[PDB]
Structure 1
Amino acid sequence: MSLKSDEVFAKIAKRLESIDPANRQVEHVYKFRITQGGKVVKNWVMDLKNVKLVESDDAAEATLTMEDDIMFAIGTGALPAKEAMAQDKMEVDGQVELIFLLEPFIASLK
């Protein structure tokens, strides 16, 4: 009934409220896919227009699908999203240029 990834999304959201217009460069919508054990069980959507996280199936500039245990690692600055993708522990769709543009942004907002 509850996923660990929720913890990361919750904290990430509260952090998005600290974002300021002074520092900018790029911002787009990102969809996250939460799988249970090894199969998709839910899909979350990141609202960049309102700066809030919500649950929807709407399209997005990119999609990041990874196991709950994996998403947590990339959320708690545990394991690098890059390496995880190398071991096939996670995948991403859409603009590979933007998806990676978030890696170095994990410090400002994951």
Structure 2
Amino acid sequence: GIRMSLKSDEVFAKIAKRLESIDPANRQVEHVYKFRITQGGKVVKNWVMDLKNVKLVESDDAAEATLTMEDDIMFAIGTGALPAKEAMAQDKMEVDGQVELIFLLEPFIASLK
């Protein structure tokens, strides 16, 4: 447990698993998103989910939409307990870039196992 553990790491492992089952013949969301996870206000980890090339990696690259939120918030949204729009209304999540692209991911949350 020497490497910082975050509840949200679990969600990212599930997202990478979900990527394994994409239907190449019927793509639905082809955008690049970045998630900046904070803890105690500081930035602890960055992930880039590239849906154009189909990859999810811990990296600090640029993206079409960037979502910044605390680890607990990412966990809550990713497990389907907190709706994204409510997180935004309560100031628990910040988004830069082409904001509307994030809404395209909502109907896929339920597919995470």
For the aligned pair, the TM-score class normalised by the smaller chain equals: 0.7 to 0.9
Cα deviation for residue 20 of structure 1 reads: 0.5
- Write the distance in 2 (CA, Å) between the matches of 1:86 and 1:25: 27
Cα deviation for residue 5 of structure 1 reads: 0.8
In the superposition, the TM-score normalised over structure 1's length comes to 0.88
The aligned residue for residue 26 of structure 2 is: 23
Q: Which has the higher mean CA deviation after the structures are superposed, 59-68 or 39-48? A: 39-48
Question: Cα 1:38–1:31, aligned 2, differ >3 Å: closer, same or farther?
Answer: same
- Write the distance in 1 (CA, Å) between the matches of 2:60 and 2:45: 9
Q: What stretches of structure 2 of length at least 5 have no aligned partner?
A: none
- Write the distance in 2 (CA, Å) between the matches of 1:3 and 1:109: 18
Task: Give CA deviations for 1:20-72 in whole Å, capped at 9, x if unaligned.
Answer: 02332331111000101223222111133442321111100010111000000
* 1:41 corresponds to 2:44: yes
Cα deviation for residue 7 of structure 1 reads: 0.2
In the superposition, the TM-score normalised over structure 2's length comes to 0.86
- Write the distance in 2 (CA, Å) between the matches of 1:67 and 1:60: 19
Asked if the contact 2:65–2:95 (Cα under 8 Å) also holds between the matched residues in 1, the reply is yes
Task: Give CA deviations for 1:74-97 in whole Å, capped at 9, x if unaligned.
Answer: 111111111011000111111112
Runs of 4+, deviation exceeding 3 Å: 107-110
Aligned length: 110
Give the superposed CA RMSD: 1.9
Q: Identity percentage over the alignment?
A: 100
Q: What stretches of structure 1 of length at least 5 have no aligned partner?
A: none
- Write the distance in 2 (CA, Å) between the matches of 1:109 and 1:2: 20
Asked if the contact 2:37–2:46 (Cα under 8 Å) also holds between the matched residues in 1, the reply is yes
Asked if the contact 1:16–1:109 (Cα under 8 Å) also holds between the matched residues in 2, the reply is no
Q: SS of the counterpart of 2:110?
A: coil
Asked if the contact 2:87–2:93 (Cα under 8 Å) also holds between the matched residues in 1, the reply is yes
2:101 to 91, 98, 105: 98
1:61 to 41, 64, 78: 64
